[PDB]
């Protein structure tokens, strides 16, 4: 697969990065993506945000990157999001204090788009898309294991800061897509399945920070299991 635009996403010239993104949009429009294809695409997208210095272009770029999910064939979305989490997991400890905030926002929007992707728009949610999104939460931020195999050939260790960020925002992002509606049976099951993943994380984790954030987010007053 020839993806010549990828190396230009890291250009110091933002006009070149913008053109490289448009080639990527057209490339995704036009065989199927492999695990290796999305790792290369997401590293290029990672560095495209890394080079973005301005607050408003960063906010647009995070939404642009998260909304790429709607351009993808149904069969490639889960492979695509695994490439995202593997990318963030590999690159996490190298992100300096000055550049962290825009990558925290990227994770939030990509997670938020993943939740919105689960939705149908009286069955309101696509359970096959729910299994894929939640299975990735179990695979990366809420994994009871400490490394992920990608074949194995490629083994990636899960950084603790990535878990801590997802633990900070998962209630925010289930609320934003409307999953905290106490009156939906379908929605409460999805929140329960996510809560069970976080509960399992708090029981097993070696990290007191992860243990504390998991416990904290499970006590969130917004969760229906904590109300009335």
Detailed description of the structure:
This protein is an all-alpha fold and 228 residues long. The chain has one domain (6-226). Helix content is 61%, strand content 3%. The protein is built from nine helices and two strands; from the N terminus they run H-H-H-H-H-H-E-E-H-H-H. It has helices at residues 14-29, 35-51, 55-66, 77-91, 100-118, 127-139, 160-176, 185-204, 208-218; strands at residues 147-149, 155-157. Strands 1-2 form a two-stranded antiparallel ribbon. Strand 1 and strand 2 (155-157) form a beta hairpin. It starts with 13 loop residues before the first helix and ends in a 10-residue tail after the last helix. 31% of the residues are buried.
Number of helices: 9
- Which strand order does the major sheet show? 1-2
Q: What structural category characterises the helix and strand content?
A: mainly alpha
Q: Whole-Å distance between the termini?
A: 55 Å
Descriptors:
228 residues; two-stranded antiparallel ribbon; globular; mainly alpha; RRP1; nucleus; Ribosomal RNA-processing protein 1; rRNA processing; 3% strand
Structure described in brief:
This protein is mainly alpha-helical and 228 residues long.
Describe the protein's topology:
Layout: H1 14-29, H2 35-51, H3 55-66, H4 77-91, H5 100-118, H6 127-139, E1 147-149, E2 155-157, H7 160-176, H8 185-204, H9 208-218
Antiparallel strand pairs: 1-2
Helix pairs in contact: 1-2, 2-4, 3-5, 5-6, 5-7, 6-8, 7-9, 8-9
InterPro entries: RRP1
Biased composition (Basic and acidic residues): 213-224
Main location: nucleus
């Amino acid at each position: 697969k020839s993806m010549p635009f990828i190396k230009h996403l890291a250009s110091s010239d933002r006009k070149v990065r913008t053109a490289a993104l448009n080639s990527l949009h057209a490339f995704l429009s036009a065989s199927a993506l492999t695990t290796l294809d999305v790792l290369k695409l997401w590293k290029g997208l990672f560095y495209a945000l890394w080079m973005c210095d301005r607050a408003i272009p960063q906010q647009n770029l995070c939404n642009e990157l998260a909304d790429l999910i709607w351009q993808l064939p149904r069969e490639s979305v889960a492979t695509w999001l695994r490439g995202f989490w593997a990318t963030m997991a590999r690159e996490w400890t190298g992100i300096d204090v000055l550049r962290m905030e825009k990558f925290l926002l990227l994770v939030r929007r990509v997670l938020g788009a993943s939740f919105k992707w689960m939705k149908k728009d009286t069955g309101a949610w696509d359970q096959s898309k729910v299994d894929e999104v939640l299975g990735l939460l179990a695979e990366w931020p809420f994994s009871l294991a400490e490394e992920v195999r990608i074949t194995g050939e490629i083994v990636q260790k899960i950084p603790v800061g990535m878990r801590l960020h997802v633990l900070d925002i998962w209630v925010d992002e289930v609320e934003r897509v409307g999953l905290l509606n106490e009156d939906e049976e379908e929605a409460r099951m999805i929140v329960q399945r996510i809560s069970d993943m976080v509960d399992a994380l708090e029981q097993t984790t070696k990290s007191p920070a992860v243990r504390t954030r998991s416990k904290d987010s499970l006590g969130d007053d917004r969760l229906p299991a904590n109300r009335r």
